[PDB]
Each structure stands twice: as structure tokens, then as C-alpha cells.
Specification:
By secondary structure, this protein is mainly beta. The protein has helices at residues 128-131, 155-160, 217-223; strands spanning 30-31, 37-38, 45-48, 54-59, 64-68, 76-79, 86-95, 106-107, 114-122, 138-147, 170-172, 188-193, 204-209, 213-215, 254-255. Bound molecules: the ligand NS(=O)(=O)c1ccc(C(=O)NCc2cc(F)c(F)c(F)c2)cc1 (2 copies), mercury (II) ion and zinc ion. It is classed as lyase.
């Protein structure tokens, strides 16, 4: 009665309502490190998050989004394979019920515990609504999470999850610094793709970081305690909200490093 990740409304069914699901530039994809083309013309990424203004965190029934004020060029992404300035609008995660799965993208078929997506829209389009209608409208920075040591910068997010346990719940979330979620290196792979959830619009330039960040078992456990359902409805734990790898088709994955 609406898409989800369940047996009856999961990824295998999305194509019925969103035919683009079987499109030419769908995400995520498997990154085969041996076939990725090192491209020397790729410029380094420019991540300027020092003026980032987070405002709210909400459980939307599919994942939890941390939203940022994108009214001005406060937190932007430029450089890399990008042409123009991209403003950060929100970030969310995809994760699994077990540590051996959770990521959307895979590297040489290897799945990580989770995947962080920092969503940005191209400023030349005026608003996000217009950007999703363009081939280069969005830029998503993907970061893999592996279970190991705790990530201090992630704890503030972890602590607030209790207040947004169910669908539709939101909590004020100001003064969060997204710089605390970045790995040391900004080396990346890039390819043209799409949103990984319906409407599955093919308007995204994907930039997937090579270096994952570590999070503790305890930190990822808290993600698994969220609910897909709203208050008063049957409880369904929010886990495995990831889409399986899609055919690469006529696309080439470029790498910024040798
Ligand atoms: N400036 S703000 O904090 O008041 C604000 C925050 C989030 C959104 C939003 O998520 N729209 C949906 C949405 C988000 C995306 F990231 C997209 F790519 C998209 F197409 C639609 C809009 C405004
Ligand atoms: N996991 S990910 O990075 O690929 C991803 C990022 C953002 C969104 C999103 O904003 N959906 C809202 C939304 C509502 C609409 F009505 C739209 F038209 C639209 F494009 C997006 C979905 C997936
Ligand atoms: Hg598009
Ligand atoms: Zn995502």
C-alpha cells in the first residue's frame, strides 16, 4: 500500500509503480576495483561544511534524516567530477540486521555494516524540486561504515534516536557538525546513477569514498532499534533498509586514485 523493504513491498516490487527501477542508470552498483578507470583529470573534492546548520532529525518510515538549512551556501560540495556548487540538504543511513550487510554499494562484492548518504542539490536549479528533474541535479557523497571502534562524532545522532523511534516523529537537532562523520582521506570513485529509493530518479552523480569510517557495535545496535511503523501500529524493526546492487549497463566507474 506504499513501498518499503518488506517481502511484499520491497525492491523487487518497486518497478510496478516506478518503471524507472529497470532504467539505464540505477543505483546502487557494485564497485569492481579492477575495472574502475583511474581518471587523472578528476579534481580533488572540496567539502566546505564549516557553516553547516542542522535543524531537525526525523524518522520518515524508511530511515532517519538529519536536515540542514539550505537557504544559502552554508554547507557545500564542489570539485571532484562536479561542475557547480552543491548545497547539503540532508544525510541518512542505510543499515542491516547483521554486521555483514547494510550498505547499498558494495566493493568487489563486499558489503559493509551500513552506508551514510550526504545528499546535495545543484544550486543553479534554484530549489531541490527542480534539481531532481535534471541529469546532474544531485550529488550524493557515500561513506561506508564498518564495525570497529566508536565514532565520537556519530554519538550525538545515536543519543537522540530514542525520541524518534516511530514513523513521523521528529526532534530538534541543531548545531550538529557533519565534519565529524568524514574519513581521513577523500579519495573516491564516481559514476552517474539515481536515487536508491522511489521515485528512483536518475539525477545523481555518485561520489563514493574509498575509506570507510568505523563505528562501534553499540552504535549500530541503536540504529536497529528504530521502527518502520508509526506509534500504535504493529512493531517492525527498521533494519535492512537497503537496495541490492543494480546492473552497471553502459556506465563506467571512475576513480580519483591509482
Ligand atoms: N531547508 S529545510 O531544512 O527547511 C529542508 C529540509 C529538508 C527538505 C527535504 O528533505 N525535501 C525533500 C527532498 C530531499 C532531498 F534531499 C531530495 F534530493 C529531494 F528530491 C527531495 C526540505 C527543506
Ligand atoms: N539513498 S539516496 O541518497 O539515494 C536518497 C536521497 C534522497 C531521497 C529523497 O529526497 N526522497 C524524497 C523525494 C520526494 C519527491 F517527491 C521527489 F520527486 C524526489 F525526487 C525525492 C531519496 C534517496
Ligand atoms: Hg533527473
Ligand atoms: Zn540513501
Amino acid at each position: 500500500h506504499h513501498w518499503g523493504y518488506g517481502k511484499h513491498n520491497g525492491p523487487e516490487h518497486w518497478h510496478k509503480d516506478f518503471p524507472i527501477a529497470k532504467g539505464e542508470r540505477q543505483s546502487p552498483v557494485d564497485i569492481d576495483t579492477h575495472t574502475a578507470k583511474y581518471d587523472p583529470s578528476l579534481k580533488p573534492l572540496s567539502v566546505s561544511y564549516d557553516q553547516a546548520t542542522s535543524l531537525r532529525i526525523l524518522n520518515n518510515g524508511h530511515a532517519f534524516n538529519v536536515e540542514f538549512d539550505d537557504s544559502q551556501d552554508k554547507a557545500v560540495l564542489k570539485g571532484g567530477p562536479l561542475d557547480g556548487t552543491y548545497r547539503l540538504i540532508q544525510f541518512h543511513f542505510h543499515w542491516g540486521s547483521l554486521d555483514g550487510q547494510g550498505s547499498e554499494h558494495t566493493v568487489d562484492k563486499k558489503k559493509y555494516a551500513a552506508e551514510l548518504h550526504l545528499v546535495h542539490w545543484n544550486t543553479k536549479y534554484g530549489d531541490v524540486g527542480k534539481a531532481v528533474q535534471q541529469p546532474d541535479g544531485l550529488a550524493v557523497l557515500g561513506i561506508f561504515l564498518k564495525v570497529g571502534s566508536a565514532k565520537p562524532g556519530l554519538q550525538k545522532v545515536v543519543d537522540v534516536l530514542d525520541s524518534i523511534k516511530t514513523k513521523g516523529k521528529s526532534a530538534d537537532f541543531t548545531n550538529f557538525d557533519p565534519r565529524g562523520l568524514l574519513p581521513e582521506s577523500l579519495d573516491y570513485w564516481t559514476y552517474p546513477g539515481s536515487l536508491t529509493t522511489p521515485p528512483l530518479l536518475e539525477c545523481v552523480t555518485w561520489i563514493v569514498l574509498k575509506e570507510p569510517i568505523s563505528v562501534s557495535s553499540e552504535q549500530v545496535l541503536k540504529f536497529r532499534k528504530l521502527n518502520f511503523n508509526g506509534e500504535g501500529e504493529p512493531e517492525e524493526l527498521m533494519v535492512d533498509n537497503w537496495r541490492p546492487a543494480q546492473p552497471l549497463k553502459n556506465r563506467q566507474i571512475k576513480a580519483s586514485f591509482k
